[PDB]
């Protein structure tokens, strides 16, 4: 399963210049649409499994 945004931080350099062409996730963030991370990490859930 190929995710679009897990919520694990954004720090400008990850989007400005090149990546804002192919990446839609930071273009959503720029327009006030923000993803929030789950309370349980994928390690926590895996630990439950």
């Amino acid at each position: 399963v190929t995710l679009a945004d897990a919520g694990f931080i954004k720090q400008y350099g990850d989007c400005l210049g090149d990546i804002a062409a192919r990446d839609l996730i930071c273009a959503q963030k720029f327009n006030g649409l923000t993803v929030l991370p789950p309370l349980l990490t994928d390690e926590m859930i895996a630990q439950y499994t």
């Binding site: 679009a4 945004d5 919520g7 327009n31 006030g32 649409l33 923000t34 993803v35 929030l36 991370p37 789950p38 309370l39 349980l40």
Partner: protein, 49 residues
């Protein structure tokens, strides 16, 4: 089990950095707080699931 949590800032989405647009958006009353409460209700329920 869940889906991506999203918060949308109703003010930045509608009016992004225009204060005069923000002063017109207040004339529509409660809707941005109601939309924040609706998406926060969805976002909390992803952890509950």
């Amino acid at each position: 089990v869940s889906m991506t949590k999203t918060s949308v800032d109703c003010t930045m989405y509608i009016c992004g950095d225009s204060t005069e647009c923000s002063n017109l958006l207040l004339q529509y009353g409660s809707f941005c707080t109601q939309l924040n409460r609706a998406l926060t209700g969805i976002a909390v329920e992803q952890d509950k699931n």
